Design an enzyme around this catalytic site. Sequence first.
Site, short mmCIF file in Angstrom:
data_model
loop_
_atom_site.label_atom_id
_atom_site.label_comp_id
_atom_site.label_asym_id
_atom_site.label_seq_id
_atom_site.Cartn_x
_atom_site.Cartn_y
_atom_site.Cartn_z
N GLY A 105 0.82 -1.19 0.00
CA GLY A 105 0.00 0.00 0.00
C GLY A 105 0.85 1.24 0.00
CG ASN A 106 2.70 4.76 -2.05
OD1 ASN A 106 2.61 5.89 -1.57
ND2 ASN A 106 3.83 4.30 -2.59
N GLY A 120 2.36 8.01 3.83
CA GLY A 120 3.49 7.11 3.70
C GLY A 120 3.21 5.75 3.10
CB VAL A 121 5.41 3.17 1.77
CG1 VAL A 121 5.21 1.82 1.09
CG2 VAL A 121 5.82 4.23 0.78
CB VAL A 122 1.22 0.35 4.34
CG1 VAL A 122 0.91 -0.72 5.37
CG2 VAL A 122 0.65 1.68 4.79
CG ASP A 131 -11.29 8.44 7.05
OD1 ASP A 131 -12.26 8.77 6.32
OD2 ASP A 131 -10.23 7.96 6.59
#
EC number: 2.7.11.26
Lengths: 350, 352
Positions: free
Chosen positions: B29-30, B34-36, B147
Amino acid sequence: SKVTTVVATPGQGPDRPQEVSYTDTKVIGNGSFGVVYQAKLCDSGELVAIKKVLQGKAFKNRELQIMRKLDHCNIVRLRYFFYSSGEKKDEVYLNLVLDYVPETVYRVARHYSRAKQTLPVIYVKLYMYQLFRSLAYIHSFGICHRDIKPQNLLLDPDTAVLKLCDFGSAKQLVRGEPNVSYICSRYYRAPELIFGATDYTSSIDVWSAGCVLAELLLGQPIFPGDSGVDQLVEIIKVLGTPTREQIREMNPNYTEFAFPQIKAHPWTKVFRPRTPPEAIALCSRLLEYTPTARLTPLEACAHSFFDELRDPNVKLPNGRDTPALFNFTTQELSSNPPLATILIPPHARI
Amino acid sequence: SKVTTVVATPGQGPDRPQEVSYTDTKVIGNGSFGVVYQAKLCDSGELVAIKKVLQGKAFKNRELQIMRKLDHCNIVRLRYFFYSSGEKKDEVYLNLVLDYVPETVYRVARHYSRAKQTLPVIYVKLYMYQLFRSLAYIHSFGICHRDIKPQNLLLDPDTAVLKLCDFGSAKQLVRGEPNVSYICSRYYRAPELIFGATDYTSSIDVWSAGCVLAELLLGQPIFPGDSGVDQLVEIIKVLGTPTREQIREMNPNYTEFAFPQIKAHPWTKVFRPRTPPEAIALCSRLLEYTPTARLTPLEACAHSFFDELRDPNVKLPNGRDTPALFNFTTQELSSNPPLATILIPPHARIQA
């Protein structure tokens, strides 16, 4: 084929109702406020779109009032309009008979995008220039569209003429009078709109327009995001961090801004290598935090990015001539007459 | 395979750093901040997700401070967390090692939707109930997720356990202190959020959850719209026209409301004929204009729509037992202890 006949009132002309007949009525859309049909006028044979909307009579239809006041070649024209009772409670429906346009900047862009390509710059110039003219025009009346997006930009394949449509969110913006901040669609909302500004100006449309231009050059939306936060992050990545001053000019007393200190990685780093410098320059002058710093629709039309259109030997890819792009009126130039010097090339006429 | 080893600080335990080694690091994920990644702990072999985010040090990471304060079986747990310099300007990155969950309510719902079907009500009950518990829990701390949406609801196919994730928008809501109105995603934003309210409460999450429930029953989002206007129109079609009073409780001084006088075409007219009456009732009590009129997450869990979960013989379709749904804590019931009377079934009080 069922031939419907009604008594409709001309759009701009004197308020003298006429008899109008049309056939081949089919549903071509089902918008928020109502259904949109597509019929064929029995006389001229021309195609038109009929937009039906629930009218409460308790008020004056804002969209209709704005449409009647507009007469521009880059704006969809209201040919006629009439009323007709519906049902469910015997409601009064307001039918707007607008001109029918084939494609939209949205569909065209999608065609190229999911074909691993970009729309030729010539079309990007032609389309954006016409959008800024229509914008220069309605803004001179103090009218703000408030929902500029690819879907609302109708196109004609052959002539390359672009027409703004869907004035359902448009409004006469008066200084000192509050305006709702929940208008305008997702990827095209200006920063001040995201920050809930209630005293924004027509400059919001210019931002929207800048997002369309950028999208046409990139092949996808420049500021995606399902939430205002995600959208704000994408904007900050490109424009940098809003100074305390800028955040104040966007208005919303969010001077208490809680976001990382990300500086901008230059526009030339945003678009493909072949992207024309002038195109990138225009975005930078269109997509500005400070709403008063953005170019005006008229100033954009005179931007060097559109110089090719002012070239005497300019022609469409299909060999045809470009549409009339220099027949400006006093009303359109009113925001800055001296600009006519550039807007109208030495050879232009009309 | 590259084996990375770092010194990480446990999630909720004492702040006593430990050595952690993981392998099979891949990007899954991005996200915005940030990136995951997704790695495998060399020891337990368990899978985890690492979320890297730019940390300015000029402040305290709000997501981290909230995650450390949480310990609930329906909330993704922060296993560890550490720092690591990045680049582009030698930045400091905050890595959050969270548990890795397979599916999400989003993916599951899409599977059924583009299969011309609806998720079995039993799953709708199990998923919603757990979401309301997690909501009852974080709300008791004064924390609002801000959210809630199908993508942030992690699921485990086998156990049917649901865990709330992504606290990047979460915040401790203090009365009298202004909150930004540009949080929460599109179809799930509560009316007051669309109206730009700046003094909203945790009831916005309840609205979001009501939108997820309705979406699970319908097969698609109940209040679509690319603009606040289009969303407002869909809400009005179902709830009717907001009274001058309701518009004022949602706050935003938009008492000067310019929208058609459309009355509501009843909820029973919104969902399919087979839709359980209780399910529709819950939506009506969750999707209210007046934020103070909406059920609280704890009151929803006690709603009749969830009675089947309190049935002694309740079981999952795959034959397994339902997750633990009654092990409520004092902290979770704090908003209204007397409700334990219903939340905890008679058979769950058998000491044995």
